[PDB]
């Protein structure tokens, strides 16, 4: 009926084991209830494919957003891939990330640094994310760090929305995405690798083994293990030209 039927409370708490430790600034913020309320607004999320595919989408989603918010380190208790979701805002942002745009003006005094599970950044992403989900995030961007439902919603918005020449992460993981000829050329073949490419490929893909891509892969594998499902192939983007 919904995504709660494929990730019950005990799985979710064990997937995100340490998010609530005392060392995590976002602790107590990311609640199971917040997750479901967010998912209910994107019924296609976790509701597109057989049960396996559905579990995989939740693994992949959680794996990418875990990386963007990790508090892990190599000798972390239960490994570095149990420390997803430790942060909800960018540490030491060097900017207000306001790029004045006629389409999306900046609200005076409002900062658009990274917030939430996908580290939503820039007035020109807060704007569209706000419109998509019925909340004015251009004037009230701190809602991505103060309201956990909105927070997860922005992450899902990014996951479910295709941008320019990139498909949605959601269509890649559910198998809906068909590479172009210029994708095959550039090395981009369906799997978690293409999603790392969608998320931060300009920096991270196409130049061989990369510890940031490795950390994303690490979360995904553990999460798929917890789910009793395989990961699929092409886990990396080491030989993929970036979409960017």
Curated annotation (Swiss-Prot):
Record-level Gene Ontology MF annotations: chitin binding; chitinase activity; endochitinase activity
Keyword flag Hydrolase: yes
Domain of life per record: Eukaryota
Active site, per annotation: 68 (proton donor)
S-S bridge residues: 24-86, 98-106, 205-237
Keyword Cell wall biogenesis/degradation: no
Reaction(s) the record says it catalyses: Random endo-hydrolysis of N-acetyl-beta-D-glucosaminide (1->4)-beta-linkages in chitin and chitodextrins
EC number(s) stated in the UniProt entry for this protein: 3.2.1.14
One example of a Gene Ontology biological process annotation: defense response to fungus
Expression across tissues: Expressed in roots, sheaths and meristems.
Key words of the record: Carbohydrate metabolism, Chitin degradation, Chitin-binding, Disulfide bond, Glycosidase, Hydrolase, Plant defense, Polysaccharide degradation, Signal
Family: Belongs to the glycosyl hydrolase 19 family. Chitinase class I subfamily.
Task of the protein: Hydrolyzes chitin and plays a role in defense against fungal pathogens containing chitin. Its overexpression confers enhanced resistance to sheath blight pathogen (R.solani).
Protein name per UniProt: Chitinase 2
Organism: Oryza sativa subsp. japonica
Underlying gene: Cht2
């Amino acid at each position: 009926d919904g995504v709660g039927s494929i990730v019950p409370r005990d799985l979710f708490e064990r997937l995100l084991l340490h998010r609530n430790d005392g060392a995590c600034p976002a602790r107590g913020f990311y609640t199971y209830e917040a997750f479901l309320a967010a998912a209910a607004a994107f019924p296609a999320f976790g509701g597109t494919g057989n049960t396996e595919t559905r579990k995989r989408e939740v693994a992949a989603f959680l794996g990418q957003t875990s990386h963007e918010t990790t508090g892990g380190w190599p000798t972390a208790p239960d490994g570095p891939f149990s420390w997803g979701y430790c942060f909800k805002q960018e540490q030491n942002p060097p900017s207000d990330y306001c790029q004045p745009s006629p389409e999306w003006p900046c609200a005076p005094g409002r900062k658009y640094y990274g917030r939430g599970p996908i580290q939503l950044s820039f007035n020109f992403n807060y704007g569209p994310a706000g419109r998509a989900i019925g909340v004015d995030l251009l004037s009230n961007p701190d809602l991505v760090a103060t309201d956990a439902t909105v927070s997860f919603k922005t992450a899902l918005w990014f996951w479910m929305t295709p941008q320019g020449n990139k498909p949605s992460s959601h269509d890649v993981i559910t198998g809906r995405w068909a590479p172009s000829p210029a994708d095959a050329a550039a090395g981009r073949a369906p799997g978690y690798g293409v999603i790392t490419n969608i998320v931060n490929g300009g920096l991270e893909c196409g130049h061989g083994p990369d510890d940031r891509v490795a950390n994303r892969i690490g979360f995904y594998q553990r999460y798929c293990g917890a789910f009793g499902i395989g990961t699929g192939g092409n886990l990396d983007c080491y030989n993929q030209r970036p979409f960017n």
